Amino acid sequence: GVLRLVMELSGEMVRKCDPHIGLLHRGTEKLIEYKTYLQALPYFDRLDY
Amino acid sequence: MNIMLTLLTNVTLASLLVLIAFWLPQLNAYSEKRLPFSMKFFLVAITFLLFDLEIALLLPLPWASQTNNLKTMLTMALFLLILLAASLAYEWTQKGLEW
Amino acid sequence: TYKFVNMREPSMDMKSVTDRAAQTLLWTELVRGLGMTLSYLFREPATINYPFEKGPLSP
Amino acid sequence: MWFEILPGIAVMAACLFIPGMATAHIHKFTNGGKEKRVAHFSYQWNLMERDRRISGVNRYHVTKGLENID
Amino acid sequence: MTMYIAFILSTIFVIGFVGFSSKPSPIYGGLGLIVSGGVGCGIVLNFGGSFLGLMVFLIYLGGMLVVFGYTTAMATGDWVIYDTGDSGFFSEEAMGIAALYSYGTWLVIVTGWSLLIGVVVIMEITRGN
Amino acid sequence: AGRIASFLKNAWAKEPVLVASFAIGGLAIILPSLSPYTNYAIRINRATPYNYPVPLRDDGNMPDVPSHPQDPQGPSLEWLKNL
Amino acid sequence: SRGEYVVAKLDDLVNWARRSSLWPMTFGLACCAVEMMHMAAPRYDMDRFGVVFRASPRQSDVMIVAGTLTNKMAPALRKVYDQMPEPRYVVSMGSCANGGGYYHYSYSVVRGCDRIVPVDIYVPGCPPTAEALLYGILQLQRKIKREKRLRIWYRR
Amino acid sequence: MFMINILSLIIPILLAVAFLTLVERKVLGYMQLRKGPNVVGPYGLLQPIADALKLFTKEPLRPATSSISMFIIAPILALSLALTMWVPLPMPYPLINMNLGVLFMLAMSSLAVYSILWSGWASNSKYALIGALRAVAQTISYEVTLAIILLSVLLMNGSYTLSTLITTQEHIWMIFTSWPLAMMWFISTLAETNRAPFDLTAGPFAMFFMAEYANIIMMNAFTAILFLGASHDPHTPELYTINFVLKTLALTITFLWIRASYPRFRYDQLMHLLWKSFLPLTLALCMWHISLPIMTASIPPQS
Amino acid sequence: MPLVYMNIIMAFAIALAGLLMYRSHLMSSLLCLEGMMLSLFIMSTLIILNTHFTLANMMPIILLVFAACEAALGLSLLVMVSNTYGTDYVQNLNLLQC
Ligand SMILES: CCCCCCCCCCCCCCCCC[C@@H](O)O[C@H](CO[C@H](O)CCCCCCCCCCCCCCC)COP(=O)(O)OCC[N+](C)(C)C
Ligand SMILES: CCCCCCCCCCCCCCCCC[C@@H](O)O[C@H](CO[C@H](O)CCCCCCCCCCCCCCC)COP(=O)(O)OCC[N+](C)(C)C
Ligand SMILES: CCCCCCCC/C=C\CCCCCCCC(=O)O[C@H](COC(=O)CCCCCCC/C=C/CCCCCCCC)COP(=O)(O)OCCN
Ligand SMILES: CCCCCCCC/C=C\CCCCCCCC(=O)O[C@H](COC(=O)CCCCCCC/C=C/CCCCCCCC)COP(=O)(O)OCCN
Ligand code: SF4
């Protein structure tokens, strides 16, 4: 998918790994609050697609 | 003369093709808008250099086999190979081949 | 009911050790994978000839 | 099917045919219908030089047989 | 006579040495040294030293100057003196070089010892601490 | 006795490349001293004429020096032919 | 005359070469990426059209935006687009990339990727079938075939 | 007519490396239950030409700050070395008949790393420089074992002349005399050309690609001549040419097969592979192949 | 003595002077050392081949190998110095003085 990953290396070995997420934050949970339950069903298809 | 002409032709062809590649799309108008220094890489380069020197010593072996002194040549040739092996083993056991 | 995926113990007799050594030195499983890819080349591809052929749909 | 890979391979094969074959024919053409003489070790070169001197046409491959012994 | 091709090659050798001896931008100095090494290999080959010229070209260029470039990137009258006879059905340079294993036993021993000691020495120098 | 066999069996596992390397190198060192053909190799090398055989001046005191290549005196290469 | 005939034929040749080898890099942002991988799967085999699978940005001819573009992601997509060599084309895949889609009224979603980059082909669907994306790629090929650069230069 | 011979060596090689892309795509596709290109050209046959034209009509992205000198030099050196390495080879008769042809090819291959070093240096990037250093280290590491294996094999040939390899294998192939050395040689030639499972890394890009594919084909031809000796009849060399070409094509298709069959190593894993498995066996078998002709009185003629 | 020997000797002298100049960049010092070695190899090979002195064909190879080993050593030293200062400038090596 889409992922940003900021890490610190000492030569070959990985010392620290900090993933940055939110590049696919669509705000599904706030959008669900404006739909009926039926209307909010299709968001779950798009969650883990 | 034949080898010189061959290299000249190869180099000329490569240069011509690279320059036409770099200049054919330059004629049309377009928009036209650190420190780390790993020691392991240096050590592997140095190990390659030393093993390359020992290979250079090994190289005359195909001609060395017609000497009438076959025993001495075999001993010395074997000695060099054994010598090369020791370098590999010493570097191995001293953690010289790690990452 | 549960299953174990990686709970096998290699045999330590001389013949089994020799078999594993032959696998290491002669690359038997690599040749096996090459063999599957070769076999798999000799069968019909799954590609359809779009746009002259179309994927199946339903009402 | 798989035999549709054969055309491109064939083309590639034909290209790899061209160099070696060409060399052979050129070695026939510049050497009077014989393989180009090999000259290692400088005794072979001396043989070629003697041939070139005794040809009478400054060409090593013009071979002189017993008809030239008089 | 090709206007003293050996002299031309020697002049290019000297010019390349003048080029990289000014020591500009050590990568450029290394490049000048590579060109000079190629020219010197050409000199030796044209002279008749096929094996020794190829040793220059392989060992020197392909290993040693390659390691120099690696480390750098990590950081911030002729024709007359010649002989008359031939060599036989062998090349004299090859026979002399191959005599290393039958005649030069002492040279082999000292060279192998020096190379092993050099491996050990590089290990110890770069150990650090 | 037991320790060496156990060590060799434990090395044949998990280190077969090193066992093979050491076996091959050891055989390369040992066998030439025991082969009966190495003297044949030395003799074949001695039998290859790279230089011209410079004739000797006869003084009436060389019975073993041939006067012609076809003469029986001198070294022979029947052993080479039969090899 | 021959002056316009030669540029017409040479333009035809250049257009054929450009469209018969389209190398895309894909922004697999979301679940339209699954359908583009299904377009590279054996059944459709995009490679058989000359369209290679997963080209690098520095040798990419076309960009396929497949998924939702969020505000956090927009600068990266514009940066990637700028890097691409010209001539470059953009295919917008799915509702999210076309106009925001099912997240159009969101505080964190770009309402259409064409606010950020120009778009040549809009492939509709949620998601478009792999066959629909193939139809869109072939439509982009026909669009490339229609263009005529040498004539414009000769007539200007 | 020497210029015609040079051209008839250079041009067909470039056509072969152009159509090797087609063959690779077609072979990988069919091993993947699909096809390769089959739309551009009657059987995909015009795909390489379309690729070349598209690449040559695309904007070149000069780094705008990097060393333009080395930026232009690197592809020149790469392609020049790639085309030069074909001259020594005897198919059956060599364009240039060198006494030390094998050593010459070794020296050319050794030079082939300067292009990687310069392209990495002139990218004006720390990450690309890291990748270039990794590539150079892998290349030099594996050319070590290439050289040692090569001299061990040549000890049965009697010289460095590549033509004599045809004479040595008049009755039997060299693959039967030393298959372990041939196995390690094949893996080392995979790792030398940066081919999977060792693939850890507009115009000039195509130039680099041409150089790499020419090196692939030349390395496989060298393997064929070294280990798979065709029979050569002096009154009809075309039989040798066809046999040698068929063997070279088989080895190149085997490279494609291997790329399609396996995952790729890590850097440290392939470094350990070389330095801890190939080098010990290579030294041991070099000792063995030095001892073998003397023990059995089978030393090759030439001195 | 012909002009080829003169040119090789002149190249050696130029490399020696360049080493003795020390503008900066100890790597350039090592480069000058190895240019001296290359000139030495070339001229020794020319002399040995010209006089047909067969057993001395051994000598150039030996020289090469030994000198290359020295380069390795020198490189190591350079590297270590950089690890202390971050760069290989000549003027960093002034801790010890007369
Ligand atoms: C004598 C006292 C020794 C004790 C002191 C020890 C000090 C250091 C030891 C190192 C000295 C080594 C001496 C060997 C001298 C070499 C010459 C001599 O041995 O004769 C040769 C005999 O060769 C022998 O085979 C040499 C074998 C020695 C090499 C094997 C082991 C060497 C190890 C030495 C130390 C190296 C590093 C440490 C390793 C543990 C010549 O052979 P030959 O063919 O008749 O003559 C050639 C001339 N022709 C062509 C005209 C015919
Ligand atoms: C020796 C000197 C060489 C110098 C460089 C020249 C480059 C090499 C020359 C060879 C080029 C090959 C041209 C191949 C074009 C034929 C392709 C043909 O099949 O396309 C069809 C014909 O379309 C066009 O009519 C083709 C126009 C191509 C150019 C026409 C003439 C150009 C000649 C000018 C060359 C002179 C160059 C001047 C400067 C070098 C349409 O098919 P397409 O739409 O794709 O596919 C649709 C998919 N379907 C069919 C399966 C449903
Ligand atoms: C009586 C006297 C006889 C003389 C002695 C002869 C005895 C010989 C017996 C042993 C010889 C075998 C040596 C052959 C090569 C061995 C090297 C080796 O085994 O290395 C492997 C690794 O080898 C590889 O895996 C490399 C594979 C890379 C992928 C390439 C796939 C290639 C396979 C397809 C077939 C290739 C065909 C090669 C021959 C081509 C001919 C031109 C070991 O590494 P690891 O298993 O990871 O563990 C080591 C740490 N304990
Ligand atoms: C005496 C003959 C001399 C000539 C032969 C040698 C030629 C080349 C072989 C030598 C190459 C150098 C080898 C260097 C040795 C270092 C070994 C080592 O350090 O590995 C150890 C362990 O290896 C060992 O066990 C040490 C050697 C073990 C013995 C190997 C074989 C010894 C003899 C076997 C056969 C003997 C003769 C054959 C008998 C059969 C009849 C012929 C740790 O392995 P790692 O990968 O670092 O860590 C693993 C965890 N990550
Ligand atoms: S456009 Fe539709 S199918 Fe594609 S990621 Fe968005 S919601 Fe899913």
Side-chain angles (χ1 to χ4, degrees), chain E residues 92-105 107, chain I residues 48 51-62:
Chain E
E92 321 178 315
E93 65 182 1
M95 289 318 105
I97 282 161
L100 167 75
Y101 300 91
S102 63
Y103 279 82
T105 294
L107 275 178
Chain I
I48 289 169
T51 56
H52 288 260
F53 181 20
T54 310
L55 270 178
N57 285 124
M58 293 176 70
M59 186 300 273
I61 309 159
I62 298 302

PDB file of all heavy atoms in Angstrom, chain E residues 92-105 107, chain I residues 48 51-62:
ATOM      1  N   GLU E  92      59.281 -15.812 -24.150  1.00  0.00           N
ATOM      2  CA  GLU E  92      60.292 -15.773 -23.099  1.00  0.00           C
ATOM      3  C   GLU E  92      59.770 -15.127 -21.825  1.00  0.00           C
ATOM      4  O   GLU E  92      60.171 -15.524 -20.724  1.00  0.00           O
ATOM      5  CB  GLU E  92      61.534 -15.038 -23.594  1.00  0.00           C
ATOM      6  CG  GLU E  92      61.888 -15.330 -25.036  1.00  0.00           C
ATOM      7  CD  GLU E  92      63.090 -14.540 -25.504  1.00  0.00           C
ATOM      8  OE1 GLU E  92      63.151 -13.325 -25.223  1.00  0.00           O
ATOM      9  OE2 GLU E  92      63.973 -15.132 -26.155  1.00  0.00           O
ATOM     10  N   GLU E  93      58.896 -14.125 -21.946  1.00  0.00           N
ATOM     11  CA  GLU E  93      58.317 -13.523 -20.751  1.00  0.00           C
ATOM     12  C   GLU E  93      57.540 -14.551 -19.944  1.00  0.00           C
ATOM     13  O   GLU E  93      57.647 -14.594 -18.714  1.00  0.00           O
ATOM     14  CB  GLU E  93      57.423 -12.340 -21.119  1.00  0.00           C
ATOM     15  CG  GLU E  93      56.183 -12.696 -21.916  1.00  0.00           C
ATOM     16  CD  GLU E  93      55.377 -11.478 -22.297  1.00  0.00           C
ATOM     17  OE1 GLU E  93      55.809 -10.363 -21.950  1.00  0.00           O
ATOM     18  OE2 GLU E  93      54.318 -11.634 -22.942  1.00  0.00           O
ATOM     19  N   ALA E  94      56.768 -15.403 -20.621  1.00  0.00           N
ATOM     20  CA  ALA E  94      55.994 -16.415 -19.918  1.00  0.00           C
ATOM     21  C   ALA E  94      56.895 -17.428 -19.230  1.00  0.00           C
ATOM     22  O   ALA E  94      56.630 -17.822 -18.094  1.00  0.00           O
ATOM     23  CB  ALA E  94      55.041 -17.114 -20.882  1.00  0.00           C
ATOM     24  N   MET E  95      57.962 -17.868 -19.901  1.00  0.00           N
ATOM     25  CA  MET E  95      58.868 -18.833 -19.285  1.00  0.00           C
ATOM     26  C   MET E  95      59.566 -18.238 -18.072  1.00  0.00           C
ATOM     27  O   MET E  95      59.666 -18.886 -17.021  1.00  0.00           O
ATOM     28  CB  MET E  95      59.893 -19.324 -20.307  1.00  0.00           C
ATOM     29  CG  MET E  95      59.319 -20.234 -21.379  1.00  0.00           C
ATOM     30  SD  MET E  95      58.146 -21.438 -20.730  1.00  0.00           S
ATOM     31  CE  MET E  95      56.594 -20.742 -21.281  1.00  0.00           C
ATOM     32  N   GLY E  96      60.032 -16.996 -18.187  1.00  0.00           N
ATOM     33  CA  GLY E  96      60.680 -16.359 -17.057  1.00  0.00           C
ATOM     34  C   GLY E  96      59.739 -16.139 -15.891  1.00  0.00           C
ATOM     35  O   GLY E  96      60.123 -16.310 -14.733  1.00  0.00           O
ATOM     36  N   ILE E  97      58.496 -15.752 -16.177  1.00  0.00           N
ATOM     37  CA  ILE E  97      57.523 -15.533 -15.115  1.00  0.00           C
ATOM     38  C   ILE E  97      57.114 -16.857 -14.478  1.00  0.00           C
ATOM     39  O   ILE E  97      56.932 -16.943 -13.258  1.00  0.00           O
ATOM     40  CB  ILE E  97      56.319 -14.752 -15.671  1.00  0.00           C
ATOM     41  CG1 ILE E  97      56.683 -13.275 -15.800  1.00  0.00           C
ATOM     42  CG2 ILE E  97      55.119 -14.912 -14.781  1.00  0.00           C
ATOM     43  CD1 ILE E  97      55.794 -12.492 -16.727  1.00  0.00           C
ATOM     44  N   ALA E  98      56.983 -17.914 -15.282  1.00  0.00           N
ATOM     45  CA  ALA E  98      56.634 -19.230 -14.764  1.00  0.00           C
ATOM     46  C   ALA E  98      57.761 -19.859 -13.966  1.00  0.00           C
ATOM     47  O   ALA E  98      57.502 -20.747 -13.150  1.00  0.00           O
ATOM     48  CB  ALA E  98      56.248 -20.160 -15.908  1.00  0.00           C
ATOM     49  N   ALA E  99      59.002 -19.430 -14.186  1.00  0.00           N
ATOM     50  CA  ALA E  99      60.122 -19.918 -13.391  1.00  0.00           C
ATOM     51  C   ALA E  99      60.008 -19.493 -11.931  1.00  0.00           C
ATOM     52  O   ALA E  99      60.898 -19.780 -11.128  1.00  0.00           O
ATOM     53  CB  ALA E  99      61.442 -19.421 -13.975  1.00  0.00           C
ATOM     54  N   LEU E 100      58.927 -18.793 -11.581  1.00  0.00           N
ATOM     55  CA  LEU E 100      58.724 -18.379 -10.199  1.00  0.00           C
ATOM     56  C   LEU E 100      58.541 -19.568  -9.269  1.00  0.00           C
ATOM     57  O   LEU E 100      58.943 -19.509  -8.104  1.00  0.00           O
ATOM     58  CB  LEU E 100      57.525 -17.427 -10.114  1.00  0.00           C
ATOM     59  CG  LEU E 100      56.890 -17.068  -8.761  1.00  0.00           C
ATOM     60  CD1 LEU E 100      57.710 -16.098  -7.946  1.00  0.00           C
ATOM     61  CD2 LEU E 100      55.502 -16.491  -8.972  1.00  0.00           C
ATOM     62  N   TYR E 101      57.957 -20.654  -9.754  1.00  0.00           N
ATOM     63  CA  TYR E 101      57.668 -21.783  -8.885  1.00  0.00           C
ATOM     64  C   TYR E 101      58.786 -22.811  -8.840  1.00  0.00           C
ATOM     65  O   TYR E 101      58.811 -23.636  -7.923  1.00  0.00           O
ATOM     66  CB  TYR E 101      56.362 -22.446  -9.321  1.00  0.00           C
ATOM     67  CG  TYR E 101      55.184 -21.507  -9.270  1.00  0.00           C
ATOM     68  CD1 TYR E 101      54.831 -20.747 -10.372  1.00  0.00           C
ATOM     69  CD2 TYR E 101      54.436 -21.369  -8.117  1.00  0.00           C
ATOM     70  CE1 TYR E 101      53.762 -19.889 -10.332  1.00  0.00           C
ATOM     71  CE2 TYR E 101      53.365 -20.510  -8.067  1.00  0.00           C
ATOM     72  CZ  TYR E 101      53.033 -19.773  -9.181  1.00  0.00           C
ATOM     73  OH  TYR E 101      51.968 -18.908  -9.155  1.00  0.00           O
ATOM     74  N   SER E 102      59.719 -22.772  -9.787  1.00  0.00           N
ATOM     75  CA  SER E 102      60.857 -23.680  -9.772  1.00  0.00           C
ATOM     76  C   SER E 102      62.163 -22.999  -9.396  1.00  0.00           C
ATOM     77  O   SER E 102      62.930 -23.557  -8.608  1.00  0.00           O
ATOM     78  CB  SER E 102      61.013 -24.356 -11.137  1.00  0.00           C
ATOM     79  OG  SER E 102      61.298 -23.407 -12.145  1.00  0.00           O
ATOM     80  N   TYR E 103      62.433 -21.810  -9.927  1.00  0.00           N
ATOM     81  CA  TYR E 103      63.643 -21.070  -9.594  1.00  0.00           C
ATOM     82  C   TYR E 103      63.474 -20.181  -8.373  1.00  0.00           C
ATOM     83  O   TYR E 103      64.354 -20.152  -7.509  1.00  0.00           O
ATOM     84  CB  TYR E 103      64.082 -20.202 -10.775  1.00  0.00           C
ATOM     85  CG  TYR E 103      64.839 -20.932 -11.853  1.00  0.00           C
ATOM     86  CD1 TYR E 103      64.172 -21.648 -12.833  1.00  0.00           C
ATOM     87  CD2 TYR E 103      66.222 -20.898 -11.895  1.00  0.00           C
ATOM     88  CE1 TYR E 103      64.858 -22.310 -13.820  1.00  0.00           C
ATOM     89  CE2 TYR E 103      66.917 -21.558 -12.876  1.00  0.00           C
ATOM     90  CZ  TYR E 103      66.229 -22.263 -13.838  1.00  0.00           C
ATOM     91  OH  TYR E 103      66.923 -22.925 -14.820  1.00  0.00           O
ATOM     92  N   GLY E 104      62.369 -19.448  -8.288  1.00  0.00           N
ATOM     93  CA  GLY E 104      62.159 -18.488  -7.225  1.00  0.00           C
ATOM     94  C   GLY E 104      61.394 -18.998  -6.025  1.00  0.00           C
ATOM     95  O   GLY E 104      60.399 -18.395  -5.623  1.00  0.00           O
ATOM     96  N   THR E 105      61.849 -20.107  -5.439  1.00  0.00           N
ATOM     97  CA  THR E 105      61.216 -20.628  -4.232  1.00  0.00           C
ATOM     98  C   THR E 105      61.315 -19.634  -3.078  1.00  0.00           C
ATOM     99  O   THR E 105      60.337 -19.406  -2.355  1.00  0.00           O
ATOM    100  CB  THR E 105      61.865 -21.959  -3.853  1.00  0.00           C
ATOM    101  OG1 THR E 105      61.584 -22.930  -4.865  1.00  0.00           O
ATOM    102  CG2 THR E 105      61.342 -22.457  -2.524  1.00  0.00           C
ATOM    103  N   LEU E 107      61.642 -16.355  -3.238  1.00  0.00           N
ATOM    104  CA  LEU E 107      60.748 -15.232  -3.494  1.00  0.00           C
ATOM    105  C   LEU E 107      59.307 -15.587  -3.156  1.00  0.00           C
ATOM    106  O   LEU E 107      58.581 -14.772  -2.578  1.00  0.00           O
ATOM    107  CB  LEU E 107      60.856 -14.794  -4.951  1.00  0.00           C
ATOM    108  CG  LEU E 107      61.969 -13.819  -5.311  1.00  0.00           C
ATOM    109  CD1 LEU E 107      61.941 -13.540  -6.787  1.00  0.00           C
ATOM    110  CD2 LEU E 107      61.812 -12.541  -4.540  1.00  0.00           C
TER     111      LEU E 107
ATOM    112  N   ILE I  48      63.918  -4.851 -18.446  1.00  0.00           N
ATOM    113  CA  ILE I  48      64.078  -6.299 -18.355  1.00  0.00           C
ATOM    114  C   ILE I  48      63.724  -6.969 -19.678  1.00  0.00           C
ATOM    115  O   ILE I  48      64.392  -7.916 -20.104  1.00  0.00           O
ATOM    116  CB  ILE I  48      63.244  -6.848 -17.185  1.00  0.00           C
ATOM    117  CG1 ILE I  48      63.867  -6.422 -15.859  1.00  0.00           C
ATOM    118  CG2 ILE I  48      63.159  -8.353 -17.248  1.00  0.00           C
ATOM    119  CD1 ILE I  48      62.991  -6.676 -14.662  1.00  0.00           C
ATOM    120  N   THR I  51      66.606  -6.171 -22.487  1.00  0.00           N
ATOM    121  CA  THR I  51      67.858  -6.905 -22.362  1.00  0.00           C
ATOM    122  C   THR I  51      67.667  -8.414 -22.366  1.00  0.00           C
ATOM    123  O   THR I  51      68.645  -9.142 -22.175  1.00  0.00           O
ATOM    124  CB  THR I  51      68.604  -6.478 -21.094  1.00  0.00           C
ATOM    125  OG1 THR I  51      67.766  -6.663 -19.950  1.00  0.00           O
ATOM    126  CG2 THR I  51      69.010  -5.020 -21.186  1.00  0.00           C
ATOM    127  N   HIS I  52      66.441  -8.895 -22.580  1.00  0.00           N
ATOM    128  CA  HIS I  52      66.144 -10.324 -22.681  1.00  0.00           C
ATOM    129  C   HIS I  52      66.635 -11.094 -21.465  1.00  0.00           C
ATOM    130  O   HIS I  52      67.178 -12.193 -21.587  1.00  0.00           O
ATOM    131  CB  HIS I  52      66.724 -10.920 -23.963  1.00  0.00           C
ATOM    132  CG  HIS I  52      65.989 -10.508 -25.197  1.00  0.00           C
ATOM    133  ND1 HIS I  52      65.057 -11.313 -25.811  1.00  0.00           N
ATOM    134  CD2 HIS I  52      66.031  -9.363 -25.918  1.00  0.00           C
ATOM    135  CE1 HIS I  52      64.565 -10.689 -26.864  1.00  0.00           C
ATOM    136  NE2 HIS I  52      65.139  -9.503 -26.952  1.00  0.00           N
ATOM    137  N   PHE I  53      66.441 -10.520 -20.284  1.00  0.00           N
ATOM    138  CA  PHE I  53      66.891 -11.123 -19.037  1.00  0.00           C
ATOM    139  C   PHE I  53      65.710 -11.900 -18.472  1.00  0.00           C
ATOM    140  O   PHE I  53      64.852 -11.351 -17.780  1.00  0.00           O
ATOM    141  CB  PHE I  53      67.433 -10.036 -18.112  1.00  0.00           C
ATOM    142  CG  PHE I  53      67.962 -10.534 -16.799  1.00  0.00           C
ATOM    143  CD1 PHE I  53      68.320 -11.853 -16.624  1.00  0.00           C
ATOM    144  CD2 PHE I  53      68.225  -9.642 -15.780  1.00  0.00           C
ATOM    145  CE1 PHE I  53      68.826 -12.288 -15.424  1.00  0.00           C
ATOM    146  CE2 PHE I  53      68.753 -10.073 -14.589  1.00  0.00           C
ATOM    147  CZ  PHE I  53      69.050 -11.394 -14.410  1.00  0.00           C
ATOM    148  N   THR I  54      65.675 -13.198 -18.789  1.00  0.00           N
ATOM    149  CA  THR I  54      64.465 -13.999 -18.634  1.00  0.00           C
ATOM    150  C   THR I  54      64.068 -14.163 -17.172  1.00  0.00           C
ATOM    151  O   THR I  54      62.916 -13.912 -16.803  1.00  0.00           O
ATOM    152  CB  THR I  54      64.671 -15.366 -19.287  1.00  0.00           C
ATOM    153  OG1 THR I  54      65.187 -15.188 -20.609  1.00  0.00           O
ATOM    154  CG2 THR I  54      63.374 -16.123 -19.373  1.00  0.00           C
ATOM    155  N   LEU I  55      65.009 -14.574 -16.323  1.00  0.00           N
ATOM    156  CA  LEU I  55      64.697 -14.848 -14.928  1.00  0.00           C
ATOM    157  C   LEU I  55      64.253 -13.612 -14.162  1.00  0.00           C
ATOM    158  O   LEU I  55      63.625 -13.752 -13.110  1.00  0.00           O
ATOM    159  CB  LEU I  55      65.905 -15.475 -14.230  1.00  0.00           C
ATOM    160  CG  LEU I  55      65.963 -16.999 -14.282  1.00  0.00           C
ATOM    161  CD1 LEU I  55      67.214 -17.515 -13.609  1.00  0.00           C
ATOM    162  CD2 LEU I  55      64.720 -17.592 -13.650  1.00  0.00           C
ATOM    163  N   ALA I  56      64.543 -12.416 -14.662  1.00  0.00           N
ATOM    164  CA  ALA I  56      64.098 -11.186 -14.026  1.00  0.00           C
ATOM    165  C   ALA I  56      62.686 -10.781 -14.431  1.00  0.00           C
ATOM    166  O   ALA I  56      62.179  -9.782 -13.917  1.00  0.00           O
ATOM    167  CB  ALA I  56      65.071 -10.050 -14.331  1.00  0.00           C
ATOM    168  N   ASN I  57      62.038 -11.525 -15.338  1.00  0.00           N
ATOM    169  CA  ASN I  57      60.623 -11.293 -15.619  1.00  0.00           C
ATOM    170  C   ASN I  57      59.771 -11.526 -14.385  1.00  0.00           C
ATOM    171  O   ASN I  57      58.624 -11.073 -14.327  1.00  0.00           O
ATOM    172  CB  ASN I  57      60.146 -12.200 -16.753  1.00  0.00           C
ATOM    173  CG  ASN I  57      60.633 -11.745 -18.104  1.00  0.00           C
ATOM    174  OD1 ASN I  57      61.270 -12.500 -18.831  1.00  0.00           O
ATOM    175  ND2 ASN I  57      60.346 -10.500 -18.446  1.00  0.00           N
ATOM    176  N   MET I  58      60.320 -12.248 -13.411  1.00  0.00           N
ATOM    177  CA  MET I  58      59.707 -12.397 -12.100  1.00  0.00           C
ATOM    178  C   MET I  58      59.580 -11.053 -11.395  1.00  0.00           C
ATOM    179  O   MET I  58      58.562 -10.773 -10.758  1.00  0.00           O
ATOM    180  CB  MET I  58      60.582 -13.332 -11.274  1.00  0.00           C
ATOM    181  CG  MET I  58      60.630 -14.744 -11.769  1.00  0.00           C
ATOM    182  SD  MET I  58      61.773 -15.720 -10.793  1.00  0.00           S
ATOM    183  CE  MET I  58      60.902 -15.825  -9.263  1.00  0.00           C
ATOM    184  N   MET I  59      60.603 -10.209 -11.517  1.00  0.00           N
ATOM    185  CA  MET I  59      60.742  -9.059 -10.626  1.00  0.00           C
ATOM    186  C   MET I  59      59.575  -8.078 -10.692  1.00  0.00           C
ATOM    187  O   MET I  59      59.091  -7.677  -9.619  1.00  0.00           O
ATOM    188  CB  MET I  59      62.089  -8.374 -10.914  1.00  0.00           C
ATOM    189  CG  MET I  59      62.507  -7.220 -10.003  1.00  0.00           C
ATOM    190  SD  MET I  59      61.474  -5.757  -9.887  1.00  0.00           S
ATOM    191  CE  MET I  59      62.126  -4.812 -11.242  1.00  0.00           C
ATOM    192  N   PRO I  60      59.092  -7.638 -11.864  1.00  0.00           N
ATOM    193  CA  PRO I  60      58.020  -6.629 -11.858  1.00  0.00           C
ATOM    194  C   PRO I  60      56.784  -7.063 -11.094  1.00  0.00           C
ATOM    195  O   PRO I  60      56.301  -6.307 -10.240  1.00  0.00           O
ATOM    196  CB  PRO I  60      57.735  -6.427 -13.350  1.00  0.00           C
ATOM    197  CG  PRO I  60      59.017  -6.756 -14.005  1.00  0.00           C
ATOM    198  CD  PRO I  60      59.563  -7.906 -13.233  1.00  0.00           C
ATOM    199  N   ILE I  61      56.287  -8.277 -11.348  1.00  0.00           N
ATOM    200  CA  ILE I  61      55.139  -8.796 -10.608  1.00  0.00           C
ATOM    201  C   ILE I  61      55.350  -8.631  -9.113  1.00  0.00           C
ATOM    202  O   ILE I  61      54.559  -7.969  -8.430  1.00  0.00           O
ATOM    203  CB  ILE I  61      54.886 -10.267 -10.976  1.00  0.00           C
ATOM    204  CG1 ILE I  61      54.823 -10.435 -12.490  1.00  0.00           C
ATOM    205  CG2 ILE I  61      53.621 -10.788 -10.320  1.00  0.00           C
ATOM    206  CD1 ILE I  61      55.077 -11.838 -12.934  1.00  0.00           C
ATOM    207  N   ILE I  62      56.436  -9.209  -8.591  1.00  0.00           N
ATOM    208  CA  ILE I  62      56.785  -9.060  -7.182  1.00  0.00           C
ATOM    209  C   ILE I  62      56.636  -7.612  -6.748  1.00  0.00           C
ATOM    210  O   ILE I  62      55.881  -7.307  -5.815  1.00  0.00           O
ATOM    211  CB  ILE I  62      58.212  -9.581  -6.928  1.00  0.00           C
ATOM    212  CG1 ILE I  62      58.307 -11.070  -7.253  1.00  0.00           C
ATOM    213  CG2 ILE I  62      58.629  -9.320  -5.499  1.00  0.00           C
ATOM    214  CD1 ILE I  62      57.352 -11.926  -6.466  1.00  0.00           C
TER     215      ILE I  62
END
